[PDB]
From a paper:
k-Turns are widespread RNA architectural elements that mediate tertiary interactions. The standard k-turn is formed in duplex RNA where a short bulge is followed by G·A and A·G basepairs, and folds to generate a kink with an included angle of 50° between the axes of the two helical arms. We describe a double-kink-turn motif comprising two inverted k-turns that forms a tight horse-shoe structure that can assemble into a variety of shapes by coaxial association of helical ends. Using X-ray crystallography we show that these assemble with two (dumbell), three (triangle) and four units (square), with or without bound protein, within the crystal lattice.
We have solved new crystal structures for two further forms of the two-k-turn unit in which the 3b,3n sequences of the Kt-7 k-turns were changed either to U·U or to GC. Both sequences confer the N3 conformation, but neither is well folded in the presence of metal ions alone. Three two-k-turn units bound to six L7Ae proteins formed a triangular assembly in the lattice with three-fold rotational symmetry. Once again the k-turns adopt the standard N3 conformation, and the conformation of the k-turns is similar in each of the structures presented here. For each two-k-turn unit the two AfL7Ae molecules are related by two fold rotational symmetry, so that three proteins lie on one side of the triangular assembly, three on the other. The overall conformation of the triangular association is similar to that based on Kt-7, with the same coaxial end-to-end interactions between C helices, but the structures are not identical. The Kt-7 3bU,3nU-based structure has a larger pore through the center of the triangle (seen clearly in the space-filling representations in Fig. S1†), the radius of which is increased from 7.5 to 14 Å. Clearly the formation of these trimolecular assemblies amplifies the conformational effect, revealing relatively subtle structural differences resulting from the change in 3b,3n sequence despite the k-turns remaining in the N3 conformation in both cases. This may be due to the influence of the altered 3b,3n sequence or the binding of the L7Ae proteins, or a combination of the two.
Author numbering:
A (entry chain G), B (entry chain H): 1 to 117
Write the structure that this text describes.
Amino acid sequence: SYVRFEVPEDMQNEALSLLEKVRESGKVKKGTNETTKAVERGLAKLVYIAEDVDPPEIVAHLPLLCEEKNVPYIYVKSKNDLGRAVGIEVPCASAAIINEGELRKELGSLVEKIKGL
Amino acid sequence: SYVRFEVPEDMQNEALSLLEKVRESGKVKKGTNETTKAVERGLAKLVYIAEDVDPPEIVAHLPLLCEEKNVPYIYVKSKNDLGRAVGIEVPCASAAIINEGELRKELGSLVEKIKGL
RNA sequence: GGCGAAGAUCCGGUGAGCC
RNA sequence: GGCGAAGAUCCGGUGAGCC
C-alpha cells in the first residue's frame, strides 16, 4: 500500500490526544503543504501522516523525506479524525508539530514508540 | 475629468494610427500593470492613457507617476479604440511603447507635439 | 445551510489567452 | 457561443476563512 508503517489504534489515538492538547501551548501546522514545507524548513518536531489519502499521490512522499531530515513522523487514522485533533473544520491528510508548548517531554516518548518498526 | 492636458481629436487619431502599425515593427506593453512597470523600470518612451476609464484610479496614477519619471504621455478618448489599436482583442485602459521599431522620426515629432499643451 | 488544509481568502510575479 | 490587459492562464508566498 501507500505508507509502509502499521500502528495500533491506541497509539494512533495517543497521537490525536497529543495533537489535540498541543495547540494551546505550542504551534502546529495543518495540511500537507504546510507540513511538507514546514518540515522542509527543518522545523518539524513530530509529523502526522495518514494513509486514507485519496489519491495516494497526496502524501505518498513525505514519510521518506521525514526519514531523511530525521524528523519524527507517525501514520495516524482518518484524515477527518486528525482534522478534529488539530481542531480545524475539514479533513487533514498531514500535520506537524512546530513548537513544543508547555508539555515538551512527551514528544520524545512518542517518537521512540514510533521507532518500534 | 482627470484630463490635465486636453488633447485634440485629430492628434489622438494620428497617435492611434501610428500605434496600429508598430507591433511587429516595434514593441509595446499592454495593460496598466505592464505600462506602469514600463514606466517604472524606465524603458517606456511614450505611453498612452485612456481617459474614459472607470474607475479613474485604474490608470489615474499613471499620468503623474509617468510625468515624474519624465516619460512623455498622451491622452486618448476611448479605452476600446486603444485596445483594438494595440492589436489585442479586448478594451485597454493604458498602453506603452518601449521600442520605437523603425518609426523614430514620426514618434519624435509627435512627442514634441505632446509637450506643448 | 453550501464551499474550504484534497488549500478559503488575500498578495507577489507573469503577460494573452481560457472555457 | 461565453470569459479576458478593468489581467486569460501559469508560477510564487500566506494558512482559515469564503458565500
